[PDB]
């Protein structure tokens, strides 16, 4: 198509974060009556833009996806386009391919929201009907209840989102946190990304460094940026390009000097520790030159290694700030002996030769001429959080920052990069023993398990085991369900109960569309994206914006907040209706008709006179955020926690954690950690002794998560009809493969198919597979090995490689051209 | 109407067109650049005696920034952001931050006269409410 | 939106007959490139029509889901037009609600055909992932070959389209025919619409009437029509619209007198023989009074007492034709003494009051005052042939027909009003005997099922006995399928063969959609249907056409006579390599490159010399019929069977059949037969004992059969999104049920589900519900019995009706206002 | 420019109409005849003091008949071959022939004036290249 309506001057116009990555770019939704449009002229238009002649380059972000026209519950019509917001500090501007798609991803009847969930759907023994939402309550609440009744909380499973951003966010996270951990009471509960109630970052936050500590202006003012397990052009986009780049062309060099008359800036310079050489290396390259990027190509798995020796190496050269040391820090002298590696020992252990260690040691930590040490920020993602062994990593790696005073000074911090947004607020998980979900239901535990906002079908890890078991429990209900007529709710509720304790399992997706999940699901019910809805979350610097909301969801689709507390209200009546008061009492607190009122019963209840327990991550400080505050605030929010709020200031925030050296320990002062090398964990070393391939596997900048609007695209469709494989060329030429044939991946976990995609700059003997995808799922040849706090391995497996054949129309529609920018 | 009306730009005789060398020129307008280029081996929707001519808009469609055609891989390039677009694939996004493909010019090959003549564009050009300003 | 693009004065044209029912009503399909446009003068635009100013009613019929934009395999795109042609004879312009989304329902990308099948599909296990058809065939043809090499043929069952149209035609029932009979040689085959190898119309046949006996024209000739068991309006649209009711309102009456200058034609009259009230007594009606118009209110299943309380009194009125008799048929004195039943008995049985069946016999059989018998034609379609025993009530029908000369004189006939339009050439079946397919693959036989172009999921009798064995039988192959790990195609074939001698079944479907079949099938294989390939068939006067090809498939679908043929030549190539002469020998006659040569082998060969058996419906003189022929005699084709051809005066054909009397016999005479009452059939009996509620089903005016298009329409989810049940308003009282509840209907066979439509028309204890749809399945709840050829009685069953719930949304969006126009 | 030019035509009052008495006006020409009831009872898209007013044109989608309002059905009628649509779901076709539902004529109604004004039509009016002529 070759036009676009434009918005007239007067449009409604609202904000919205983008619903995907943690950058949390932020973008305008512009709303009009189909019929209407505005002027070519600039100030006939809403985006003040003049469409009378070309526009210059950079002038706007505005193609034909970033618009559509959307009908209401009413059947009125309505134009809206999605575009970036210029003066938003994150983004300056920029938007992303992920979420310049947002204006196709809302609902409409007709296009790629057409099958989104809109009303109940249920599996009645042996095929999909539409169920009532009274209905779809009285099942799944009667069912929760004769579990509690029965076996207690235990027998009830879920696995939920606990991010933010869309199918999270503050108001969700507390919903759904309230339900599970306050109501119901059950320690039977993972996460989307990992299987079982813990965090990613448990050994930063023990030694006292929370893993959000920065500002994104700190990777403007920094002398160097390491980038470790990260792909962050890919992956984080809008930071990398809005923040790192400007960094590494010198146009931030007169704010460093303006903020530090005295200290010298030289050109600044990037680090990547990844085995794979990515577009993020090749792009740093291109901008920086190759003398400014150093690409530590390490072994898989080897990052406690190279953070050991570099840790020992900078303390031999007095590399270190033994003031901030003494005065901030408990375990120094603990940690250099436990942790003690030469660089030899190093280089063999990770393959990086000793002078490029010494190289990055001296960019990083050596001090400069004029006295102080480098501003180096450190950046980390799955890499390493689904490295091996989590906990060691950070330990190590922390240990290096702490003895270098690389956080807390500004350009400087430890950091996530993130993956979702974030949002959490919820009550505190209600057991003390860390449970693996999928094994116990592999082992036959639970009689229901609901996925929430999540698809471990494609994202578990080991997940050709899960999803085997989950396909043949669901299969023992369904045949149960088969033989009633005529039933009751109370009957089929005892007709499946009774399955349950045959080996069956019953199954609740809760979700925007069926997804695969709907292979084995018994019940799935219609949830609400940002603009359907109100959502407020922060993005990778703390900085809390309000999505608003501009259109109605689809059918009786509901906020996710909204749906559990449909969930606790049936159930709070069941147990009013059988005499038990001090149950229906646990279902207290959900008298909520607006998602606003999950917002202020959680976020901002933390730290209250009265509260509850209460886990924020906007803290004590929470109930001073209101979202008529953050509608003022626009989409530069506020860097979170909030120090003060008055009429004349708006919302104060907090750019950088850290800044006095006083650290979230018992103590105030960070904690050094033991760092031990180990190798291998044995269940991967098995797989690597036996099987010829590392399956490295990971993200796509076109492709986001699961793909569950991108599988509903034609373009996205064309271009990744089936998941890639990126193989180095000799070993494609020894297995006679090319761009295009099809391969089966498989070790003793499970076995998956994905498109070969050769790439020059993958190494002999390492692949990289496209994670979590519609059409070859990668999860299915990734082990089952988890660190002490069950935070999986995803990036530690290997397999062998079987052609299949050659998909000629892939070879006629696909390219497989680099995705390498030279 | 529902059609815009687009001009109808001489734009060479094929014969001139050496293999995989670009020709630029102006389409629908002068402010809209263009490469044309016979790739040398065919492809779906090429034109000309080998069925090997195609022709693009070379502004970025992520936000407008001149792309350069890169002869050795056959795509066009835009260094604002890193987006890449395949040639002999109809535009198609191989990495990058762009939401449509680089923009089609629609070339008519008519075999009595050998001219190519540039006739539509398939995809709206960045900048531009609709491709005939 | 609120225009439409105009096809150029010099677009491309081509025809097309529509796609879906028996009428085959001719449209045509205006292609051109997406840029250009017509202009609104009349002579510049292929319509031909005056856009200057509005056009008067009846000028056209043309809607924004008549109009689509297709991608072609070049990337190329082309607005078309899919409009019906003013002159071609069966439609005379006219488009039903079916037909007229034609272009709507042509492939696209983003549009209502997103979802079409586009390559190869292969359930690995445990997910759906693209495969290569060269993979799809060493496995498909593998599995084949293993089993005919082991248990031969009877190992191999199809459930196989037989019929025209799109999904059916004479190259594809071919290229399936030669395959599964020719070449595997299975007798393990059944029918899209029934359980086994048979025919509808078995009893009419061996009579020596075949059911497709006259042409649309003597609709228009007659004095009175009977639809028995037919709801035309609604299944048959534009032959009543543009025949039927043009006789109703006098327009005919000149044409009669035309052709017989000393008859009496009194004004034309209308019985319908149906249980229920439906849209088309109303619309009759409606055009010619309720004193021209007889609803013969039959008890469920009284078809035959009925015929023979009307055959016995037309012989003791002496109003039958004794010297026709007497001349052209053999039997008649016996079926006077077996079939004899009085009229007080006859309206005991069926309800029907005795003036009522005095009134339609003197108005259909008493001779007029100028001595000639009334010209009655007897219009029959699934409210008998799937009614109380099949054969029985064709037998008492024909009895009351060939004895009242009503077959072979213009303006009479009794035939099938047709469901799809029919287009078989097929080799004879390789069996002599009948088989219950579905009960064989309940009970445990076959290794591998195909169902091709039809979806028994939705449509078998007994459906969920059916699903339930397929789902149990394939999970056995998905989980024997999961400890695979590197397994050759050899490999694989062995592990799934091997599940099959432990209770499993490989399940293929070839099909334009995944479908509900996704829910069991192993692999899924991607057809193309009129339009991307040329195809012939016939409606239900047997009027050939040729639909042409105008734009490709998507991806690599293909047509099904050249799935047909790969599968041959996969079979030939591996019996070849496995030194099998006579094997391969067996799957020789398959060098196919376009459908036209499936076209060339079989339906041009017909009774030729050196051709092998083979069973036309173009007969012997098919080969006079070509591509080119057909593509000149224009959307009129010609009616079978082809009498003459040259180049002066084209395709010659037959108008009627058995116009002097002689029948399909061993003598050349019509046989009357027996036709015992003997009440409903025990089974179904059991159930109306049982049960309150006698559960009607079949056809609504807007939903083509499966839904497979329709499924992905906005409008027509918005219109019926679950399958609805008509339900008298007193009933509903009664159960406390308005429009929009959803209600459990259920008996000893299953439980199914549907939205309630109170329509003042049903009969109290009576219901309607819509069948074969993708919300809510019918076919659950009739039962198994079958005539004595394995004919089913899915009109005959009885169940009761429990409220689940009210679906606000179904309330707030959906019409449930009268379907009758009054 | 993208969108059709409709006329802001002036119907009537809202006060003026009684429940369930259809009005006649052309709408956006003196060849569209239209037809604006106000219902009585709320339907989403209704406007008004009761959200009760719809107006639709009443050319049959299928072929152009001019249909004709059902006062007790609240329908709109064609009796050429039959379809019926609901003036209660925005025209939704009820049973028939047409591929497109009734089409929605689009009021204003202003509480300053009480003035109901047709602005918009949402479909495509029969026997029309676009609605604006
Ligand atoms: N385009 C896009 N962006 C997204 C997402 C998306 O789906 N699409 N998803 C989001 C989410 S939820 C997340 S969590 C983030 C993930 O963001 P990242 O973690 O940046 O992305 P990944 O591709 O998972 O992995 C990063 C790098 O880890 C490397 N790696 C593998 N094994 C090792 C190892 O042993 N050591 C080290 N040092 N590196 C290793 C890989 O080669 C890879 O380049 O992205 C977010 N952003
Ligand atoms: N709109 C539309 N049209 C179609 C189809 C479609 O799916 N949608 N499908 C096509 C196909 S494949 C077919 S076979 C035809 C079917 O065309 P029809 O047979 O005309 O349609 P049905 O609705 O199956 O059944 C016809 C009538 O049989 C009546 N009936 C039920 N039981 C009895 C009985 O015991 N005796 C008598 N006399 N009548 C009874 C029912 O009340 C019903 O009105 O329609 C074809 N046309
Ligand atoms: S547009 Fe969206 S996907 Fe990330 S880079 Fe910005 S938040
Ligand atoms: S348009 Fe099609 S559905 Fe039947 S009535 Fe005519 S053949
Ligand atoms: S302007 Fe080309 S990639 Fe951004
Ligand atoms: S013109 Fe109205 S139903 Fe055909
Ligand atoms: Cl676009
Ligand atoms: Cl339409
Ligand atoms: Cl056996
Ligand atoms: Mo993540
Ligand atoms: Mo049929
Ligand atoms: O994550
Ligand atoms: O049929």
Chains 1, 3 share one sequence.
Request: charged content about 20%; aromatic content about 10%; hydrophobic content about 35%.
């Amino acid at each position: 198509n070759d036009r676009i309506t434009l918005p007239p001057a007067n449009a409604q116009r609202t904000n919205m974060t983008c619903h995907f990555c943690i950058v949390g770019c932020g973008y305008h939704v512009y709303k009009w009556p189909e019929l209407q449009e505005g002027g070519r002229a600039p100030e006939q238009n809403a985006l003040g833009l003049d469409f009378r002649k070309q526009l210059p380059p950079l002038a706007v972000t505005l193609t034909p996806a970033m618009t559509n026209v959307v009908t209401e519950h009413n059947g009125r019509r309505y134009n809206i386009m999605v575009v970036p917001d210029k003066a938003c500090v994150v983004n300056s501007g920029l938007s992303s391919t992920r979420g310049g798609k947002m204006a196709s991803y809302m609902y409409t009847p007709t296009g790629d929201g057409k099958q989104r969930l809109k009303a109940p759907r249920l599996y009645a023994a042996d095929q999909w009907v539409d169920t009532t939402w009274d209905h779809a309550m009285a099942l799944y609440a009667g069912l929760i209840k004769k579990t509690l009744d029965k076996d207690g909380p235990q027998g009830v499973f879920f696995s939920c989102f606990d991010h933010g951003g869309a199918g999270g966010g503050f108001e969700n996270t507390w919903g759904t946190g309230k339900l599970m951990f306050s109501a119901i009471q059950t320690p039977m509960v993972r996460i989307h990304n990992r299987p079982a109630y813990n965090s990613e970052c448990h050994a930063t936050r023990e030694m006292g460094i929370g893993e959000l500590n920065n500002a994104y202006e700190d990777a403007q003012l920094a002398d160097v940026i390491w980038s470790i397990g990260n792909n962050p052009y890919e992956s984080q986009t809008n930071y990398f390009l809005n923040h790192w780049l400007p960094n590494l062309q010198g146009a931030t060099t007169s704010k460093k000097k303006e903020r530090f008359p005295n200290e010298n800036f030289p050109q600044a310079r990037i680090i990547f520790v990844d085995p794979r050489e990515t577009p993020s290396v090749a792009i740093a390259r291109h901008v920086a030159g190759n003398d400014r990027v150093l690409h530590l190509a390490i072994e898989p798995g080897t990052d406690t290694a190279l953070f050991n020796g570099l840790f020992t190496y900078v303390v031999e050269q007095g590399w270190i700030d033994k003031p901030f040391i003494e005065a901030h820090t408990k375990g120094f002298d603990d940690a250099v002996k436990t942790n003690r590696l030469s660089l030899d020992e190093c280089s063999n252990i990770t393959g990086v030769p000793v002078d490029m260690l010494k190289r990055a040691a001296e960019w990083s930590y050596k001090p400069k001429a004029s006295g102080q040490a480098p501003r180096t920020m450190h950046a980390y993602e799955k890499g390493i959080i689904w490295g091996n062994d989590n906990y060691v990593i950070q330990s190590a790696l922390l240990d290096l920052v702490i003895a270098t005073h690389n956080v807390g000074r500004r350009g400087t911090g430890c950091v996530r990069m993130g993956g979702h947004q974030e949002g959490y607020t919820r009550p505190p998980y209600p057991g003390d023993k860390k449970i693996y979900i999928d094994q116990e239901l592999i082992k036959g535990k639970g009689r229901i398990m609901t996925w929430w906002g999540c698809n471990n079908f494609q994202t578990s890890n080991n997940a050709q085991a899960l999803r085997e078991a989950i396909l043949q429990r669901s299969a023992i209900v369904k045949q149960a369900m088969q033989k009633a007529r005529g039933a009751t709710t109370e009957e089929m509720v005892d007709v499946i109960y009774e399955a349950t304790q045959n080996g069956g399992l019953f199954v609740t997706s809760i979700n925007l569309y069926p997804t695969k999940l709907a292979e084995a699901a018994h019940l799935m019910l219609p949830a609400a994206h940002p603009g359907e809805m109100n959502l407020t979350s922060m993005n990778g610097e703390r900085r809390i914006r309000l999505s608003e909301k501009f259109m109605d969801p689809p059918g009786t689709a509901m906020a996710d907040c909204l749906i559990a507390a449909r969930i606790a209200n049936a159930l709070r009546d069941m147990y009013q209706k059988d005499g038990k008061a001090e149950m229906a009492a646990q279902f207290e607190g959900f008298d909520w008709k607006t998602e606003e009122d999950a917002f202020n019963d959680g976020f901002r209840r933390a730290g209250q006179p009265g509260a509850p327990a209460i886990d924020s991550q906007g803290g004590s400080t929470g109930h001073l955020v209101t979202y008529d505050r953050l509608r003022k605030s626009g989409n530069n929010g506020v860097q979170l926690p909030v120090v003060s709020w008055d009429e004349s200031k708006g919302l104060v925030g907090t750019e950088m954690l850290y800044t006095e050296g006083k650290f979230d320990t018992d103590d105030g002062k960070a904690h050094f950690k033991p760092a031990p090398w180990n190798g291998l964990p044995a269940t991967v070393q098995q797989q690597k002794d036996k099987y010829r391939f590392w399956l490295n596997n990971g993200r796509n900048n076109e492709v986001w998560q699961t793909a569950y609007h991108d599988q509903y695209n034609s373009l996205m469709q064309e271009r990744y009809p089936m998941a890639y494989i990126e193989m180095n060329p000799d070993d494609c030429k020894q297995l006679d493969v090319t761009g295009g044939d099809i391969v089966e991946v498989y070790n003793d976990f499970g076995s998956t198919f994905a498109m070969v995609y050769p790439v020059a700059e993958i190494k002999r003997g390492q692949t990289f597979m496209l994670f979590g995808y519609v059409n070859g799922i990668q999860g299915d040849v990734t082990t089952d090995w988890t660190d002490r706090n069950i935070i999986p391995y995803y990036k530690g497996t290997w397999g062998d490689i079987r052609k299949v054949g050659s998909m000629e129309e892939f070879k006629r529609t696909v390219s497989f051209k680099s995705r390498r920018f030279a | 109407r529902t059609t815009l009306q687009y001009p109808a730009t001489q734009v060479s005789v094929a014969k001139n067109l050496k293999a995989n060398e670009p020709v630029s020129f102006t389409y629908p307008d002068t402010s809209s650049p263009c490469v044309a280029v016979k790739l040398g081996s065919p492809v779906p929707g090429g034109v000309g005696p080998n069925n090997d001519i195609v022709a693009y808009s070379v502004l970025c469609t992520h936000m407008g920034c001149p792309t350069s055609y890169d002869k050795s891989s056959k795509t066009f390039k835009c260094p604002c952001h890193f987006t890449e677009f395949d040639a002999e694939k109809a535009g198609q996004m191989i990495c990058g931050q762009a939401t449509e493909n680089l923009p089609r010019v629609l070339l008519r090959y008519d075999e009595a006269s050998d001219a190519l003549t540039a006739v539509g564009v398939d995809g709206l050009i960045y900048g531009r409410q609709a491709n005939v300003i």
